[PDB]
């Protein structure tokens, strides 16, 4: 019903979004950051005691 568009009834307006996307990143990784790495050439490995 187009009539008296005054008082916050206006089309073709900007929205003023946020230029950032807030997201949590719990990337602590306390164990793997200390375990270590070592190359392997087979899908099966073993050790002895």
């Amino acid at each position: 019903n187009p009539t008296l568009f005054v008082s916050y009834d206006q089309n073709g307006k900007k929205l003023s979004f946020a230029n950032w996307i807030s997201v949590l990143s719990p990337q602590d990784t306390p164990f793997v950051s200390m375990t270590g790495k070592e190359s392997i050439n087979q899908t099966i490995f073993s050790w002895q005691t």
Binding site: N1, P2, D9, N11, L15
Partner: protein
Amino acid sequence: NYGRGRELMYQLEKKGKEIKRDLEKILLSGQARTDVLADQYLTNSAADPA
């Protein structure tokens, strides 16, 4: 005008802006977000049926 002469009652520009201590409570109060735009804010469905 021989008595009261405090700037002819020009107050309410500073030291008297108490509205701030009400804004603070309005912010730190548990009031809902009631509105009338159906929570969309961009309905615009054939010229704002509302």
